[PDB]
């Protein structure tokens, strides 16, 4: 597999989004997520994903429970992290991306990377990455 | 004043929070905010703010409109950034912190730094910083 991306918390914050109940992705990715990109990937995002992400790009989808307390949305406990790692050589079947997921204990989750990719094929125009950098 | 903190977007993401209507800070800081700390300040946060932040610490409060569209919370347009810059020498009246605010055009806002500090005095125990680093 891919080793847990130690240090992703200190990478560049790309964007945030909360998926609320009834969202089509709510059952698998419900809650508040933050996206982080490592230094290798950053410039592709800043230029608007017009060229493919270089090999060594790592993108982290950090999913937290969304807690409404009083009149605030707060970050709750981590549910999981999703990872995409670019290596055209290693991952020819999934558009050159390695798809990985880890739970809050940092242990790998048993996922079908092909099922991750199947949805990310919707974003094949921007190298299988949905998110845009929010300045 | 303080020059606009160019490059804060690439600093460490400390935490996020949405203030909803009826929150006591809703009129001035309503929306989704993200907090960023520069490298100088990071370690004080990681150690749980038991010691004061070193001189040269810069913390950014990035406030965005919260847009509910479908069953999602999305980041809307920037409302403002608030900045705290640690310099015990320059800011003896406000606990060694410079308080600054900038609008979306990056232009300074006319604020009373003493009014910022008056509220942050609630957090005098942790060097006038409310937020904790969310691992
Ligand atoms: C559709 C049914 C999806 C499935 C299955 C998976 N992902 Fe995905 N992913 C999806 C969307 C719509 C987005 C964008 C969210 C946003 O805030 O804009 C994402 C994003 C990611 C990211 C961030 C990179 C990006 O493409 O924007 C990563 C690291 C990611 N997803 C990983 C991932 C993994 C590991 C999956 C299988 C376990 C997976 N995704 C499935 C939509 C869908
Ligand atoms: C209470 C009435 C406040 C006034 C007036 C101001 N601030 Fe503040 N600030 C407040 C809280 C409760 C928090 C924490 C928010 C969170 O998500 O936990 C903040 C935070 C900041 C930050 C981030 C650093 C921190 O203390 O956690 C900055 C950079 C900041 N605030 C700046 C700021 C400025 C420039 C103000 C006057 C224009 C100001 N604050 C007023 C509460 C209050």
Residue numbers in the entry:
A (entry chain A), B (entry chain A): 1 to 135
Authors' own words:
Here, the current status of the fully automated ambient-temperature beamline VMXi at Diamond Light Source is described, and a highly efficient pipeline from protein sample to final multi-crystal data analysis and structure determination is shown. The VMXi beamline and its associated PXF within the Research Complex at Harwell offer a highly automated pipeline where researchers provide a suitable protein sample that is used for robotic crystallization, monitoring and subsequent in situ data collection from crystals in crystallization plates or in thin-film sample delivery systems. Here we present illustrative examples of data measured using VMXi from a variety of proteins comprising both conventional crystallographic standards and ‘real world’ user samples. Routine RT data collection provides a useful capability that is highly relevant to studying protein dynamics and ligand binding without the complication of cryo-cooling.
Other users tend to focus on groups of proteins with homologous functions from a range of microorganisms. This is the case of a group working with cytochromes c′. Furthermore, they pose a challenge as their heme centre is very sensitive to radiation, and thus careful data collection and analysis are crucial. A second cytochrome c′ protein from T. thermophilus (TTCP), in this case with β-sheet fold, presented a greater challenge. Firstly, crystals grow in clusters of stacked plates [Fig. 2(f)], making it impracticable to harvest and cryo-cool without further optimization of crystallization conditions, but the ability to collect data in situ at VMXi made it possible to carefully select positions for data collection around the edges of the cluster [Fig. 2(f)] and the microfocus beam allowed useful datasets to be measured. A full comparison between the RT and 100 K structures was not feasible because the crystallization conditions as well as space group differed.
